[PDB]
Swiss-Prot record, chains A, B:
Protein name as it appears in the record: Polyadenylate-binding protein 2
Segments forming domain RRM: 7-84
Post-translational modification: Arginine dimethylation is asymmetric and involves PRMT1 and PRMT3. It does not influence the RNA binding properties.
Tissue localization of expression: Ubiquitous.
Associated disease: Oculopharyngeal muscular dystrophy 1: An autosomal dominant, late-onset, slowly progressive myopathy characterized by eyelid ptosis, dysphagia and, sometimes by other cranial and limb-muscle involvement.
Organism expressing this protein natively: Homo sapiens (Human)
Asymmetric dimethylarginine carried by residues: 73
Residue numbers carrying Omega-N-methylarginine: 73
Function: Involved in the 3'-end formation of mRNA precursors (pre-mRNA) by the addition of a poly(A) tail of 200-250 nt to the upstream cleavage product. Stimulates poly(A) polymerase (PAPOLA) conferring processivity on the poly(A) tail elongation reaction and also controls the poly(A) tail length. Increases the affinity of poly(A) polymerase for RNA. Is also present at various stages of mRNA metabolism including nucleocytoplasmic trafficking and nonsense-mediated decay (NMD) of mRNA.
Comment on protein domains: The RRM domain is essential for specific adenine bases recognition in the poly(A) tail but not sufficient for poly(A) binding.
Signal peptide (residue range): none
Length: 88, 88
């Protein structure tokens, strides 16, 4: 829901070989993670997918923003709050 | 939405090392896959997570039911229609 979403980030430029363990490991230093959701629309060739990371605390979202443009599995990831293009 | 959900299955007993490519490969014979969603609540130790597979055609859901109790990454998976515990 909206409260879980307020504690979540969108992570762009994720590939079809990414695992939840790898993603949690990348964001571990930002704080405790409740849930990792990976959404893939391509399963071979050029990838097409993203993830949501739901943190336990809201302050971890702000912290995680420093990981925008960081290298994850050899690709620069995009990190924004999950509710960015949503009212509030 | 409800129409995407009607073309989707829930897959239980998925672990934090599962990839979308592996999951699509397991269900490939059932028909074309639109999207794989992996949802993990544990990232080490005993796993806790599941997935949704959204097929291109609704008939692929029925076909995929034969994969209930099949071995995926060394574990017996649970396959049910995504809207099972939902009205319709």
């Amino acid at each position: 829901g909206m409260e879980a979403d307020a504690r979540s980030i969108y992570v762009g430029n994720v590939d079809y070989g990414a695992t939840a363990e790898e993603l949690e490991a990348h964001f571990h230093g930002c704080g405790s993670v409740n849930r990792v959701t990976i959404l893939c629309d391509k399963f071979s060739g050029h990838p097409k997918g993203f993830a949501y990371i739901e943190f336990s605390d809201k302050e971890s979202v702000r912290t995680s923003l420093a990981l925008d443009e960081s290298l994850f599995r050899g690709r620069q990831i995009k990190v924004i709050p999950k509710r960015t293009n949503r009212p509030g």
